[PDB]
Design a binder for this molecule. Structure first.
Ligand SMILES: NS(O)(O)c1ccc(OCc2cn(-c3ccccc3)nn2)cc1
Ligand SMILES: [Zn+2]
Length: 258
């Protein structure tokens, strides 16, 4: 009886195995745009993905991860609210069963169809496992998805999904360029938070871009054909793999833009 996104194992149950679920800096949160304050001291984001080396794509039973070679400073995130260098390890998405839900963060209570998380770890801690034990261990760049025009740079991801339909399946996924998933603007909100899945560790500096990317209905429909289950098990569609907004508590969300 492991955690998931069903009625009997979903987000409202997680606290029983992971008491930090009710902690002081949990994610995601609602971003109240009128309360978020412009912070002129915040720097522009530095997203350096030109040397990114993708390796593999994995259905882990709660989403799919596109994994990168993080044994050197290839693809890194710096600047903004961050001190030091954060290495890209993987990206994944959260999405809904319908276009009107799927994102984890919300903006003035608006839910987007999906949310992309580019996960980076602070290289002062040496490896990812050590980094998640630190309050400034990770930086996750969050990007909203809305349904409209297709995102050409997403299609290579979409088309490999039939080969990793079920939990535990992986496929080679080399030479994928994550720059093709970014929006035009790097304007962002930032706040201190947590992993949005168990173990829910409070180790993340969240950087959530204001500008959503557009993906087509056909693209998101292919996300929704994935399975939570393993091969040969009763089919349960991988949809609604998002945690709802958590209490903001003693936190301020800062904006990089006026
Ligand atoms: N959704 S999110 O972007 O917040 C997000 C990002 C990263 C996550 O990592 C889970 C994880 C894996 N490990 C681990 C550590 C050492 C060895 C093996 C696994 N620890 N936490 C979860 C959610
Ligand atoms: Zn995530």
């Amino acid at each position: 009886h492991h955690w998931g996104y069903g009625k009997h194992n979903g987000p409202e149950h997680w606290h029983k195995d992971f008491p930090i679920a009710k902690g002081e800096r949990q994610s995601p949160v609602d971003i109240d745009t009128h309360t978020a304050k412009y912070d002129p001291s915040l720097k522009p984001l530095s997203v350096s993905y030109d040397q990114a080396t993708s390796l593999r794509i994995l259905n882990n039973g709660h989403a799919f991860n596109v994994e990168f070679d993080d044994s050197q400073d290839k693809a890194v995130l710096k600047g903004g609210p961050l001190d030091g260098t954060y290495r890209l390890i993987q990206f994944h998405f959260h999405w809904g069963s319908l276009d009107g839900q799927g994102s984890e963060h919300t903006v003035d209570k608006k839910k987007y169809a999906a949310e992309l998380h580019l996960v980076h770890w602070n290289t002062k801690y040496g490896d990812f496992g050590k980094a998640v034990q630190q309050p400034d261990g990770l930086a996750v760049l969050g990007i909203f998805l809305k349904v409209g025009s297709a995102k050409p740079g997403l299609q290579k991801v979409v088309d490999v999904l039939d080969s990793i339909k079920t939990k535990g399946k992986s496929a080679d996924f080399t030479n994928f360029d994550p720059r093709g998933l970014l929006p035009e603007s790097l304007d962002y909100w930032t706040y201190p938070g947590s992993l949005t899945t168990p173990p829910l560790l409070e180790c993340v500096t969240w950087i959530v871009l204001k500008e959503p990317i557009s993906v087509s209905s056909e693209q998101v429909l292919k996300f929704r054909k994935l399975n939570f289950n393993g091969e040969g098990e009763p089919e349960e569609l991988m949809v609604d793999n998002w945690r709802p907004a958590q209490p903001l508590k003693n936190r301020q969300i800062k904006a990089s833009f006026k």
